[PDB]
Amino acid sequence: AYTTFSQTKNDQLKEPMFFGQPVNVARYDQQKYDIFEKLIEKQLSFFFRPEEVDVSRDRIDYQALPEHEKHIFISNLKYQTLLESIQGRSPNVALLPLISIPELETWVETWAFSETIHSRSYTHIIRNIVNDPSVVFDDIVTNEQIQKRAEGISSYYDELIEMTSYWHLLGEGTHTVNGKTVTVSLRELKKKLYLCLMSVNALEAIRFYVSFACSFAFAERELMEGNAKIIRLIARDEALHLTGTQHMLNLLRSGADDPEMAEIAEECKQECYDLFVQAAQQEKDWADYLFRDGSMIGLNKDILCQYVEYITNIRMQAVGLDLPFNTRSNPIPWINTWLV
Amino acid sequence: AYTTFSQTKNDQLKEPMFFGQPVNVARYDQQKYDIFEKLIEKQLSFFFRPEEVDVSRDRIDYQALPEHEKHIFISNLKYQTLLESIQGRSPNVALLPLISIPELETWVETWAFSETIHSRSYTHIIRNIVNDPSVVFDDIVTNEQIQKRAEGISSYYDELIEMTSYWHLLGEGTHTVNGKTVTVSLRELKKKLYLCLMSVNALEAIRFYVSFACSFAFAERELMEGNAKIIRLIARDEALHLTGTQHMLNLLRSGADDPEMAEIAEECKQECYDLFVQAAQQEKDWADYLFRDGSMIGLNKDILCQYVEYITNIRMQAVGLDLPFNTRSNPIPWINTWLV
Numbered sequence: 001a002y003t004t005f006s007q008t009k010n011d012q013l014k015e016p017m018f019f020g021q022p023v024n025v026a027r028y029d030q031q032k033y034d035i036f037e038k039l040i041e042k043q044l045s046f047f048f049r050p051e052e053v054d055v056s057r058d059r060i061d062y063q064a065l066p067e068h069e070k071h072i073f074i075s076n077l078k079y080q081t082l083l084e085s086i087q088g089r090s091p092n093v094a095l096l097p098l099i100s101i102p103e104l105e106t107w108v109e110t111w112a113f114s115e116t117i118h119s120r121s122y123t124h125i126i127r128n129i130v131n132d133p134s135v136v137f138d139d140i141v142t143n144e145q146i147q148k149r150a151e152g153i154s155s156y157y158d159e160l161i162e163m164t165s166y167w168h169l170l171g172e173g174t175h176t177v178n179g180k181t182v183t184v185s186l187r188e189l190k191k192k193l194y195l196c197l198m199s200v201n202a203l204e205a206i207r208f209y210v211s212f213a214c215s216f217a218f219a220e221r222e223l224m225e226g227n228a229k230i231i232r233l234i235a236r237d238e239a240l241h242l243t244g245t246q247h248m249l250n251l252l253r254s255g256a257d258d259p260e261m262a263e264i265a266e267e268c269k270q271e272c273y274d275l276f277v278q279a280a281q282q283e284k285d286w287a288d289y290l291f292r293d294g295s296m297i298g299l300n301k302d303i304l305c306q307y308v309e310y311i312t313n314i315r316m317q318a319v320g321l322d323l324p325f326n327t328r329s330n331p332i333p334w335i336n337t338w339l340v
Numbered sequence: 341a342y343t344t345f346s347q348t349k350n351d352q353l354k355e356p357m358f359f360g361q362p363v364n365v366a367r368y369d370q371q372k373y374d375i376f377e378k379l380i381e382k383q384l385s386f387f388f389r390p391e392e393v394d395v396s397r398d399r400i401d402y403q404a405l406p407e408h409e410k411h412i413f414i415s416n417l418k419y420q421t422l423l424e425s426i427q428g429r430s431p432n433v434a435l436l437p438l439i440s441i442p443e444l445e446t447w448v449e450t451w452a453f454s455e456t457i458h459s460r461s462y463t464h465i466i467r468n469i470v471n472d473p474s475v476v477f478d479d480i481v482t483n484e485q486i487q488k489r490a491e492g493i494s495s496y497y498d499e500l501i502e503m504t505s506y507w508h509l510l511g512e513g514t515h516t517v518n519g520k521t522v523t524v525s526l527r528e529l530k531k532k533l534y535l536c537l538m539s540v541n542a543l544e545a546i547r548f549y550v551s552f553a554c555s556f557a558f559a560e561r562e563l564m565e566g567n568a569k570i571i572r573l574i575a576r577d578e579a580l581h582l583t584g585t586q587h588m589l590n591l592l593r594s595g596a597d598d599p600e601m602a603e604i605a606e607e608c609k610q611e612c613y614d615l616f617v618q619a620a621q622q623e624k625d626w627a628d629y630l631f632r633d634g635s636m637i638g639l640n641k642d643i644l645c646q647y648v649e650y651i652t653n654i655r656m657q658a659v660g661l662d663l664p665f666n667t668r669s670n671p672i673p674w675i676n677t678w679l680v
């Protein structure tokens with residue numbers, strides 16, 4: 001079972017990242033993997049207050065926007081708000097019960113906390129550009145075009161969480177529950193974690209970044225500048241989150257942290273590849289719904305699909321997956337002015 | 341049954357604090373109880389960076405400190421470190437999966453996050469006053485006297501977590517797990533959550549404050565000035581945390597939230613009372629160990645016991661419980677100087 005304070009004195013430097021003894025003492029004078037301590041420090045140094053950013057001129061810019069451009073901006077904003085809602089709670093609920101080294105535990109909480117600041121940031125923006133925020137927030141849960149993503153994301157988390165509970169409650173083996181056989185395998189749980197981490201890595205590395213291009217395109221035309229300033233701060237944080245997931249995945253696949261995981265990762269290689277491409281395709285399909293009533297200056301369906309493939313190739317190569325698209329240089333070099 | 345993003349469009353203003361539909365959209369433009377949004381805002385305004393606080397002078401003070409005084413200072417520090425390690429992760433693992441309103445969800449994550457900063461604060465202090473931090477940190481896990489005082493904390497959380505897992509996995513009813521009859525009652529789960537909350541209230545409002553008195557006793561001597569600055573920052577946060585738990589508990593008691601919780605609070609009033617009496621005794625029994633090699637002017641077993649009864653009565657009255665101890669004046673008025 002899981003415990004909030006394992007009574008066994010253990011060498012936290014020798015535990016695997018996940019599935020080892022639950023973390024007891026929270027100390028930061030030493031780490032098995034210093035990268036996580038460096039990320040905690042950097043993230044703490046990046047704390048910011050959304051409410052302090054002036055977004056008053058965004059309201060007029062928005063109202064002045066053509067109806068199709070308002071649709072593009074608001075749709076994108078809703079999607080970002082959805083992702084931050086999930087990322088503020090999920091890393092904690094899903095990973096905290098499985099982490100066995102202190103630096104990773106605190107990094108996860110720090111990462112999750114920064115995501116909640118991002119959510120508060122979007123509330124700040126929304127309240128400053130529309131008369132009734134409720135209109136926007138309610139459309140997030142039910143928007144068909146948006147939910148054809150949250151579902152896939154929430155699924156990986158939910159499945160991992162459920163299997164984690166069965167593991168902590170019953171342990172490994174073949175069990176019976178109300179007339180049904182329930183099999184609990186640590187190997188399958190480890191796979192569920194790897195798949196979930198790969199999914200979150202794509203979320204942090206591609207899903208967020210595709211939306212940033214949408215927001216900064218307005219900023220290039222000197223519009224929605226308050227929103228832009230807030231997005232730059234958020235993007236600065238996501239870069240850290242992506243560094244974290246990449247290190248977790250690379251440490252797990254190399255076999256240096258857990259030989260079994262490396263074995264499992266090699267085995268589900270094609271699955272992770274498809275999972276990554278699927279996310280890229282979902283971002284691609286959004287472009288259609290996004291630019292249905294027309295596109296705008298500096299951004300269109302074609303340019304967006306190009307950027308998705310460009311970014312996807314980079315991210316997949318970063319975690320050892322084959323490149324799914326033809327190589328090319330950045331289709332929108334101007335984005336570099338706004339990104340880390 | 342738990343999900344990271346419930347697909348049902350629900351009015352978050354009408355959900356109960358706990359056990360309702362899992363929070364989907366993280367919005368901060370409105371709230372059922374604005375007190376939690378006010379707490380989030382305040383806690384964010386109190387963000388501080390421990391490592392900035394100079395504690396080099398503390399090393400000198402500590403070493404030049406009389407042996408028995410080093411024992412008192414270090415023992416108190418190790419207990420505080422234990423509580424922060426627990427409080428940094430527990431609210432998230434035990435409460436997040438059960439919260440149903442966005443303002444409370446984020447407050448818990450913000451509260452827990454601040455506790456991790458407190459943990460980092462203690463690493464900063466420990467690493468700077470001792471030659472080998474590993475001796476201190478490892479003793480935290482094995483020290484029978486420390487685990488004796490904290491007995492009951494991790495246990496409560498762990499029980500709530502297991503029962504919560506059974507609830508999410510099997511739902512309400514009587515089940516058969518591996519041939520054993522397992523009963524899952526929402527009513528009983530609610531009781532467990534309520535008692536866990538009263539326990540955390542006692543931890544935040546009593547256990548932390550008794551430790552602050554020991555720390556400030558040195559500050560009164562113009563010693564351990566760096567530690568003192570940090571403890572003042574920590575105390576500032578704990579005041580918000582206990583304000584939060586007192587409000588959660590009293591709102592539940594009022595019957596304005598979940599009607600069943602009002603019934604439960606009433607039914608287990610003797611249990612609530614017993615929790616405090618037990619905790620108070622634990623804090624007192626700790627005196628024997630703390631002052632085993634001698635005490636200090638103004639800080640001894642009798643004074644500690646008087647302070648424990650003093651603060652316990654104050655805290656119990658704040659949540660509507662009868663007072664177990666004889667009424668009395670503050671035995672250490674000098675502490676007011678350091679608090680608030």
Ligand SMILES: [Fe+3]
Nearest residue numbers: 084114115118
């Ligand atoms: Fe974010």
Ligand SMILES: [Fe+3]
Nearest residue numbers: 204237238241
């Ligand atoms: Fe992120």
Ligand SMILES: [Fe+3]
Nearest residue numbers: 424454455458
């Ligand atoms: Fe604390």
Ligand SMILES: [Fe+3]
Nearest residue numbers: 544577578581
């Ligand atoms: Fe606290």
Ligand SMILES: [Hg+2]
Nearest residue numbers: 156157196199
């Ligand atoms: Hg996931």
Ligand SMILES: [Hg+2]
Nearest residue numbers: 094196197200
């Ligand atoms: Hg995940």
Ligand SMILES: [Hg+2]
Nearest residue numbers: 072214215217
């Ligand atoms: Hg756009």
Ligand SMILES: [Hg+2]
Nearest residue numbers: 210213214304
């Ligand atoms: Hg885009």
Ligand SMILES: [Hg+2]
Nearest residue numbers: 268269271272
């Ligand atoms: Hg995989």
Ligand SMILES: [Hg+2]
Nearest residue numbers: 198272275276
């Ligand atoms: Hg994948």
Ligand SMILES: [Hg+2]
Nearest residue numbers: 284305308309
């Ligand atoms: Hg594409």
Ligand SMILES: [Hg+2]
Nearest residue numbers: 302305306309
């Ligand atoms: Hg393309």
Ligand SMILES: [Hg+2]
Nearest residue numbers: 496497536539
């Ligand atoms: Hg508890």
Ligand SMILES: [Hg+2]
Nearest residue numbers: 434536537540
């Ligand atoms: Hg609790």
Ligand SMILES: [Hg+2]
Nearest residue numbers: 550553554644
């Ligand atoms: Hg004390």
Ligand SMILES: [Hg+2]
Nearest residue numbers: 531604607608
């Ligand atoms: Hg009860």
